[PDB]
């Protein structure tokens, strides 16, 4: 049986403030720009509709200095950090941003007649941009959050899948990486493999894997390691109703319609896609730039950061403004306007500021407690005396940024106010 | 007189947690796809605008092992489960989705445009998609929920109904079963019989019976078995105003207009349909993924699950994203784009986590209590020593999934912290 | 080590009211109009989307007339004003206002189908107006607020930036001064240097620097001088989706779409701009015309106004109505309408009522306290015996508007009711 961590983790009154200075990323919100086109190094894909998974590295409390040497006995005790409070400060202004495809696979405007539709062209893909669903989510664990998506199933050897058929859909639970893309109103699925035309969804989610956090597995985790703190805020609606150009693999049954004559002899495209939109970006609907405390967690892990590390998965699509940058191709700006002689760039910026209030915690390593933690994860006992090594995170190192002076910092001031 | 169930049902202090791990269904959101065409098995009509009626099977408490045998006397008592708490974790991403008809019987836009003011005889059906009313309903009973809809009346032998006349609408109170269609903004009505055109409503409700729960009828139930817990939230508006093509069976009276000349000599189509639309899908207005306790019920039955079974009728249209999957006809995807070489499919995915906290309850089977239960339902005494045979439910089996270790499960943790 | 101000600042019971009677500015909301067109002096650029930083000048309390001369010791104690209450009265009616460009660099509407979907050449720029994001922020400090924006980076001499390439974006923290333009939904960016088109954004932000207050920077300020009171309320959405005309330096990768035919043989313009819009200007969402008290502050200064000065950075875009003034070019207004005989002027008006309740405070100048004050700011000891010289602040002089009789003024009555 998994016990609550308060039985074998003793909370003491020693609190610390750990804060990253300033986290800034600038990059193209749709694709990674490789070096060679006139810029040094690769411009990353920095988007607001993208998972920001910070791997917060904490110092080992068993080796660095403490206010009291006699607060614990090193022979029979080992220390661990517990996140007592969090502050995900966002610097950039609230804004809306657009992602779109130059060839968006939409056939007709199924909402109503638009008087701009032309049925003379075979390829009806046009430059279409949408906003996405307004998503804010903040997950703190000592393990990274688990995200679900829909992908192609395995290929059966006995009955092969014929080309053109709908592949079987499986729900894959992966680790939410830094740079994974959040749900956008088009669903959490593998658009690289499920969608072959590369034209049905906008440019950032075109060849990416959109992932939604599987809160059922993180809540149903026995130890509560992957998620002991969570906030959600989602908002979307359908602006424009669109068809999908292509052959209908799932033919409509004859019992569902009455045949006409000519183009109405056979039914048209019946795969319908809505245009997602986070409706209004308001400052009153913000779960960021606000202090959040961890008196009680959802799981058995009550904020205790095992292996001296924390994982903060943050999605903030409320600050999604992609800056538009123009560069004149001529060294003087021309007197008369020529659209050919101006280069247009889209650059999205993410500004993050991570404050945490951590609590020192003594663990009495008795035989039963040691056996329980060994059955939990033996690497804790190996370190006291790295599974997530290939996987990519935004690493923030607060090893030298722990401080006993809480009042020097805003989250520490708020913590001292509430205490 | 029907008494409240708390008079003869004694609630013990022991509780159980019972929860299905994950209920996943992938299927076409508009119709069932027959076998063949690359599918070795059928593709069900899995839709968000559809009744998910789970038949939860509980073990017979008079038979399996208990932590203390001496809590009841088998000679003079019997046991029954009472639902003390529920959590319907609906784990998909929040999203919007469209249902549409390739031949939607809309004449023209009567909202703004100077469209037409005449009878039209040619085929003007257009490929039109709509969203629906954003509704969530959660009903727990020990009997399946009742649903009201409007259908054709019986054929009177004295006065037969002539062909083309409007048949008399009558209110049928059927059973809300799995696969039944929820109200979609077009009304709770049998569209298969009352609409012979098969073109006025989208494909998922074109030949289906849309049913709405008659909350008046199952709250006026003497025993309250069909519904002891209910949550409602409906939200819709009208996007587009549409005239319906065809002959007007009920002619507009001459005292309601003034005749014009020529084209406006006679009134046009006057059957008007709105385009339903759930306004904004927002996460704070969700009544799922939340724990709900059953201290008091609306009726006499206070959550007591007779015949060791439960019925959970769930509609959540707030996660209605139809994933669009396209597959290229050629084995390599060509560099040039051809619209007819990509087969298109729509797949809706439904993901559930049904967690319950049940309370063991003993029944002091005296003469009056036994007579009252026998008058209430004679099958309870026969079981203590199946009317829903043809009805289609999502049968979930929780026979071997009952646990006394409440703190190891999320709903058990929330129940222990709330008590 | 910075300490909270309450340890060395003694709060007295003497309160004062300070209020500018009426602060009115009328000016062209898009640009500054120089003199020479038949009028005296220059019409300033007065816009609602513009930072109003009031430099409030307070009398020096060491020489100010006080009700009790013997309430302190001149030899061992010095005096300072502490802001106890504030009210930013806004006089103009609530309203929406528009700013636009006669040549707005948009290619086509990517919201839906737009027809003539590919403009191959020629000038496409259109006379386009937008509203902006609804922003209300009010910041009081004893130092001016710190605002962030994105500007061009410093070009390296070893690797100069080639013409036409995207310059590196650098986050500059400047001082929020009067006349600075707030972020308007297009991004807190330097539009003078980062957009060579001078056609990308409306005229009021076309050649201006849009700044957003770096709340993280002045919240993490040790002394908390720049911000001890702050209110924010931002609200926006995307009305129209527009595509930026011009050459693309960041070419869309070939693996990220499928090549079309003819006009679709190249990907079109893929830099997308939303149209910002404050959704609804509603009276209960106003954070102005309301009294706010300063019992506790986020920083270490609890409203203490060092150097006998205050800085109130206020933007209120909820009253953004740009009045339209038509003047006929004929001395009699003609009875026959000619479009070219009326001159149109846009004039925006700002009405402000700065109101404060200040508290007298004594500083016991003990040697360690004096050392702490000298370490915080050496100019305080010089004054007790400026860096903001070139900065443009709206200077208001409340040296001769301090009154002990609070009940004669509205904020004094509300303070007496509150206290």
């Amino acid at each position: 049986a998994v016990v609550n961590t308060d039985d074998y983790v003793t909370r003491t009154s020693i609190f610390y403030h750990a804060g990253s200075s300033r986290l800034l990323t600038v990059g193209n919100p749709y694709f990674r720009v490789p070096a060679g086109g006139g810029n040094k190094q690769d411009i990353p894909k920095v988007s607001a509709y993208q998972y920001r998974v910070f791997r917060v590295q904490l110092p080992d409390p068993n080796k660095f200095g403490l206010p009291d040497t006699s607060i614990y006995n090193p022979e029979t005790q080992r220390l661990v950090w517990a996140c007592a409070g969090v502050e995900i400060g966002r610097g950039q202004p609230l804004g809306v941003g657009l992602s779109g495809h130059p060839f968006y696979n939409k056939l007709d405007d199924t909402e109503s007649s638009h008087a701009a539709t032309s049925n003379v062209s075979e390829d009806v893909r046009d430059n279409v941009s949408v906003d996405y669903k307004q998503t804010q989510l903040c997950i703190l664990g000592c393990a990274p959050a688990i995200g679900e998506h829909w992908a192609k199933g395995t290929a059966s050897k006995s009955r092969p899948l014929s080309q053109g058929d709908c592949p079987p859909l499986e729900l894959k639970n992966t680790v939410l990486e830094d740079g994974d893309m959040v749900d956008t109103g088009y669903g959490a699925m593998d658009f690289s493999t499920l969608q072959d035309t590369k034209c049905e969804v906008p440019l950032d989610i075109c060849q990416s894997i959109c992932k939604y956090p599987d809160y059922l597995q993180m809540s149903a985790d026995p130890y509560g390691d992957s998620m002991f703190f969570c906030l959600r805020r989602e908002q979307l609606f359908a602006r424009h109703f669109w068809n999908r150009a292509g052959t209908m693999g799932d033919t409509v049954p004859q019992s569902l319609y009455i045949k006409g004559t000519g183009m109405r002899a056979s039914p048209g495209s019946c795969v319908y896609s809505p245009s997602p939109s986070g409706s209004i970006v308001t400052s009153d609907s913000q779960l960021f730039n606000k202090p959040y405390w961890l008196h009680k967690a959802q799981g058995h892990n009550n904020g205790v950061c095992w292996h001296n590390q924390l994982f903060v998965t943050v999605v903030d699509t409320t600050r999604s403004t992609n800056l538009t940058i123009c560069a004149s191709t001529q060294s003087p700006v021309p007197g008369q306007y020529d659209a050919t002689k101006f280069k247009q760039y889209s650059r999205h910026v993410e500004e993050y500021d991570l404050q945490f209030i951590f609590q020192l915690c003594t663990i009495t390593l008795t035989a039963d407690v040691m056996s329980y933690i060994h059955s939990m994860n033996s690497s804790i006992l190996e370190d006291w005396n790295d599974p997530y090594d290939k996987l990519k995170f935004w690493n923030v190192d607060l090893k030298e940024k722990f401080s006993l002076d809480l009042d020097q910092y805003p989250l520490g001031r708020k913590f001292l106010v509430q205490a | 007189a029907v008494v409240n169930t708390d008079d003869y049902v004694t609630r013990t202090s022991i509780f159980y947690h019972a929860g299905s791990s994950r209920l996943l269904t992938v299927g076409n959101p508009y119709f069932r796809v027959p076998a063949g065409g690359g599918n070795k098995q059928d593709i069900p009509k899995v839709s968000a605008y559809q009744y998910r009626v789970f038949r939860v099977q509980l073990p017979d408490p008079n038979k399996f092992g208990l932590p203390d045998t001496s809590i009841y006397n088998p000679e003079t008592q019997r046991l029954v489960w009472a639902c003390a708490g529920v959590e319907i974790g609906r784990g998909q991403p929040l999203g919007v989705g469209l249902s549409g008809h390739p031949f939607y019987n809309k004449l023209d836009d009567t909202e703004s445009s100077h469209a037409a003011t005449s009878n039209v005889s040619e085929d003007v059906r257009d490929n039109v998609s709509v969203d629906y009313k954003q509704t969530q309903l959660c009903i727990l009973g020990c009997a399946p929920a009742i649903g009201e809809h409007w259908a054709k009346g019986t054929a009177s032998k004295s006065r037969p109904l002539s062909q083309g006349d409007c048949p008399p609408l009558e209110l049928k109170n059927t059973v809300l079963e799995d696969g039944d269609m929820v109200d979609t903004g077009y009304g709770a009505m049998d569209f298969s019989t009352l609409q012979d055109t098969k073109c006025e409503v989208p494909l998922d409700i074109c030949q289906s019976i849309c049913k709405y729960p008659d909350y008046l009828q199952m709250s006026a139930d003497p025993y309250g078995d069909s519904m002891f817990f209910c949550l409602r939230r409906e939200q819709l508006f009208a996007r587009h105003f549409w005239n319906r093509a065809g002959t007007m069976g009920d002619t507009v009276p001459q005292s309601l207009y003034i005749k014009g000349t020529g084209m406006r000599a006679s009134p046009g189509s006057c059957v008007y349909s709105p385009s339903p639309s759930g306004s904004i899908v927002t996460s704070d207005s969700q009544l799922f993924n939340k724990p709900y306790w059953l201290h008091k019920a609306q009726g006499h039955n206070n959550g007591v699950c007779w015949h060791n079974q439960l019925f959970v009728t769930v509609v959540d249209t707030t996660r209605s994203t139809n994933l669009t999957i396209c597959a290229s006809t050629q084995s390599p995807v060509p560099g040039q784009y051809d619209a007819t070489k990509f087969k298109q499919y729509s797949r809706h995915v439904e993901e559930y986590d049904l967690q319950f906290i049940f309370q063991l309850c003993t029944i002091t089977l005296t003469a009056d209590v036994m007579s009252y239960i026998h008058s209430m339902n004679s099958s309870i005494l026969e079981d203590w020593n199946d009317p829903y045979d043809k009805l289609k439910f999502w049968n979930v089996d929780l026979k071997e999934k009952f646990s006394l270790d409440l703190d190891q499960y999320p709903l058990g943790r929330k129940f222990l912290v709330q008590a | 080590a910075v300490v909270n101000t309450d340890d060395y600042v003694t709060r007295t019971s003497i309160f004062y009211h300070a209020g500018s009677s009426r602060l009115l500015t009328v000016g062209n909301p898009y640009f500054r109009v120089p003199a020479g067109g038949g009028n005296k002096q220059d019409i300033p650029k007065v816009s609602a989307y513009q930072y109003r930083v009031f430099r409030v000048q307070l009398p020096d309390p060491n020489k100010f007339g006080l009700p009790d001369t013997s309430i302190y010791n001149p030899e061992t104690q010095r005096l300072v004003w502490a802001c106890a209450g504030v009210e930013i009265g806004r006089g103009q009616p609530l309203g929406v206002g528009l700013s636009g460009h006669p040549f707005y660099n948009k290619l086509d509407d990517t919201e839906s189908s737009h027809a003539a979907t590919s403009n191959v050449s020629e000038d496409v720029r259109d006379n386009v107006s937008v509203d902006y994001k609804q922003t209300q922020l009010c910041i009081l400090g004893c130092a001016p607020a710190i605002g962030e924006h994105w500007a061009k980076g410093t070009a390296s001499k070893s690797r100069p930036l080639s013409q036409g390439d995207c310059p590196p974006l650098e986050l500059k923290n400047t001082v929020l001064e009067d006349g600075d333009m707030v972020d308007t939904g297009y991004g807190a960016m330097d539009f003078s240097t980062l957009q060579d088109t001078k056609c990308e954004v409306p005229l009021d932000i076309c050649q201006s620097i849009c700044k957003y207050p770096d709340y993280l920077q002045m919240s993490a300020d040790p002394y908390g001088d720049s911000m001890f009171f702050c209110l924010r309320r931002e609200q926006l959405f995307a009305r129209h989706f527009w595509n930026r005309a011009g050459t693309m330096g960041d070419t869309v990768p070939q693996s990220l779409y499928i090549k079309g035919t003819g006009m679709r043989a190249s990907p079109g313009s893929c830099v997308y701009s939303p149209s910002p819009s404050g959704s609804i200007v509603t009276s209960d969402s106003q954070l102005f015309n309301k009294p706010y008290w300063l019992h506790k502050a986020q920083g270490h200064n609890n409203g203490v106004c060092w150097h006998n000065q205050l800085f109130v950075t206020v933007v209120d875009t909820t009253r953004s109505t740009n009045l339209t003034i038509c003047a006929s070019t004929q001395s009699p207004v003609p009875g026959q309408y000619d479009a070219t005989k009326f001159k149109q002027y846009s004039r925006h008006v700002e009405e402000y009522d700065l109101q404060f309740i200040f508290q007298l405070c004594t500083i016991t100048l003990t040697a360690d306290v004096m050392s702490y004050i000298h370490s915080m700011n050496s100019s305080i000891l010089e004054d007790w015996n400026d860096p903001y010289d070139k900065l443009k602040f709206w200077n208001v002089d409340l040296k001769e508007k301090f009154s002990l009789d609070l009940d004669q003024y509205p904020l004094g009555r509300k303070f007496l009711v509150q206290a």
Partner: antibody
Amino acid sequence: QVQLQESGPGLVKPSETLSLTCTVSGGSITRYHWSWIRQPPGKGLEWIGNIYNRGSTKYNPSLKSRVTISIDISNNQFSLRLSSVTAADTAVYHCARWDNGHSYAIGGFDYWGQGILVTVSS
Amino acid sequence: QSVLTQPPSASGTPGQRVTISCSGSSFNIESNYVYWYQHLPGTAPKLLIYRNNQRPSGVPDRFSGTKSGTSASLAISGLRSEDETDYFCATWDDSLSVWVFGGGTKLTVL
């Protein structure tokens, strides 16, 4: 069946205005696009422009300065005006029903007028 | 390509197959639907092929349409004496943004 008829002056003197009208019988005008297409003798067809159902116009750019197309819903007609005609504007003019603007539009001109021969001479 | 390249005339044995070609460019024929029309002097043109292969109601099934690359072809199987008439192709030029038409193909039934 939808039928199109052209009416107008057969002979138009040069530098005057060429006026033609097309009447639709057996169909409605507020549904599809309506185009004017001219064939000079000795050569092929030449597109002029079309009028929408709502009243929006599109034109051939090479004739865009000289072509005005109007629509009359009450008269169920649509008219072509061609100012400053030259000798090259002598042509057989056909009004046609460009099926466009909806989901099941075939594209192109499903129904054609017979056309009227307009000769420009002094 | 303002004028689609068509043969000035075509001939064929009755009962045989006659193919009329129509050459355009990547902006008019390859990227848009081509429509094949039947026109006789003195009568209104009649649509035969729409969306490069489909036929309307009343058009005989012997007429067929194909489109390969930037070229299109109209095939008449079982040539009859009533087919001695002009045929042409029409499509939409995106580069010129107009309706381009073929020069016409007077078919003689020999």
